[PDB]
Amino acid sequence: LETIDYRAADSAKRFVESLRETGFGVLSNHPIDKELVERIYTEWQAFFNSEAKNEFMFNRETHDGFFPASTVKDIKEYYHVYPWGRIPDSLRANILAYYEKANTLASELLEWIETYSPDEIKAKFSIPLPEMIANSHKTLLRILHYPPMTGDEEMGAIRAAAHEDINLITVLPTANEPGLQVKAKDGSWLDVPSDFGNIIINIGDMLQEASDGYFPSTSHRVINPEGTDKTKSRISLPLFLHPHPSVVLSERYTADSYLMERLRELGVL
């Protein structure tokens, strides 16, 4: 999986072709203020290390807020940020500044995808791809925190199980902790280059459907390669771009009916 220079004359073309083949695209030298991202990591790490985080227990109805690890206990805790949702006062400015900058970049990347789609694929998009996410109510910024392992606790081979994203596209800065991998056509796992300043973008199931399979939603995971430090906290900031529910993806589905169908496949009551 090759890292592409956002500044390069041919970057758009190579980026979308990366998406078409692998389902993923990696960009270095991107326009999102890198010092803003590190500021964000620091202050959210403080937040997760604080007792005050429990004041923001997620709302039962809408699932915006803080989700603690916990009987049974998961190995991550997280926070769901929505522009419309509950956000702590002292973290609001930065996180929404990032949210907006990430959306704007996503919107540009969606233009690129549409530009370099063949005419027979372009013709299947009910509206232009960037419009599908403009002021999307469902777009979610997930602040993920994996805490240090304490004492006896043993770290697994796999940190995040293999999976496909359901949404349109997902945007994630890396933090130079290798482990993210994507499924290749031949059953092997390709390592996503995760140097500082890279941003990783991937196709989710709804753009796969909108494109009639042309852009594939690829299974991906995060492993713990040999010599990963069990005592370090890992924070990550994935942004899941969702289309408006009423967007017609194909002759078979709208975004809303595609989601409901998934809910029935999973047997959710």
Q: Which residues in this chain contact its own copies in the complex, by CB under 8 A? A: 54-57, 59-63, 65, 67, 71-75, 78, 80, 84-86, 126, 135, 137-138, 140, 142, 158, 163, 166-167, 184-188, 213, 219, 240, 242, 244-246, 248, 250-254, 256-257, 259-269
Cβ neighbours of 192 (radius 10 Å): 22
> What is the 8-class DSSP label of residue 62?
T
Question: Are 69 and 77 contacting, i.e. CB atoms less than 8 angstroms apart?
Answer: yes
Residues just before a chain gap in the chain (C–N exceeding 2.5 Å) are 70
Minimum distance, C-beta of residue 112 to its own copies, in the bound complex (Å): 23
Q: Is 197 in the site for Cl ion (CB under 5 A)?
A: no
Minimum distance, C-beta of residue 186 to its own copies, in the bound complex (Å): 4
Question: Are 156 and 222 contacting, i.e. CB atoms less than 8 angstroms apart?
Answer: no
| Residue from 12, 20, 243, 215 nearest 112 by CA | 12
CA distance 116 to 120: 11
Judged by beta carbon, residue 4 or residue 180, the one nearer Cl ion is 4
Residues 76-95 as x/- pattern, contact with Cl ion by CB under 5 A: ----------x---------
Q: Is 244 in the site for Cl ion (CB under 5 A)?
A: yes
Q: Is 138 in the site for Cl ion (CB under 5 A)?
A: no
CA distance 109 to 103: 10
Judged by beta carbon, residue 30 or residue 183, the one nearer its own copies is 183
Judged by beta carbon, residue 9 or residue 268, the one nearer its own copies is 268
Considering CB distances under 5 to 8 angstroms, the limit depending on partner class, which of its own copies, Cl ion, none binds residue 72? its own copies
Judged by beta carbon, residue 3 or residue 219, the one nearer its own copies is 219
Q: Is 245 in the site for Cl ion (CB under 5 A)?
A: yes
Q: Which residues pair with 181 in a beta bridge?
A: 191, 221
Q: Is 17 in the site for Cl ion (CB under 5 A)?
A: no
Minimum distance, C-beta of residue 246 to its own copies, in the bound complex (Å): 5
Considering CB distances under 5 to 8 angstroms, the limit depending on partner class, which of its own copies, Cl ion, none binds residue 125? none
**What is each CA distance from 119 to 34, 114, 122, 143, in whole angstroms?**
36, 9, 5, 37
Please enumerate in sequence order all residues whose Cβ is within 8 A of that of 135, keeping only pairs 6 or more positions apart, or say none. none
Please enumerate in sequence order all residues whose Cβ is within 8 A of that of 188, keeping only pairs 6 or more positions apart, or say none. none
Minimum distance, C-beta of residue 196 to its own copies, in the bound complex (Å): 26
Q: Is 13 in the site for Cl ion (CB under 5 A)?
A: no
Minimum distance, C-beta of residue 152 to its own copies, in the bound complex (Å): 12
Q: Is 43 in the site for Cl ion (CB under 5 A)?
A: no
Kindly give the pairing relationship between strand 24-28 and strand 189-191: unpaired
Question: Are 224 and 44 contacting, i.e. CB atoms less than 8 angstroms apart?
Answer: no
Considering CB distances under 5 to 8 angstroms, the limit depending on partner class, which of its own copies, Cl ion, none binds residue 5? Cl ion
Binding site for Cl ion (CB under 5 A): 4-5, 8, 86, 244-246
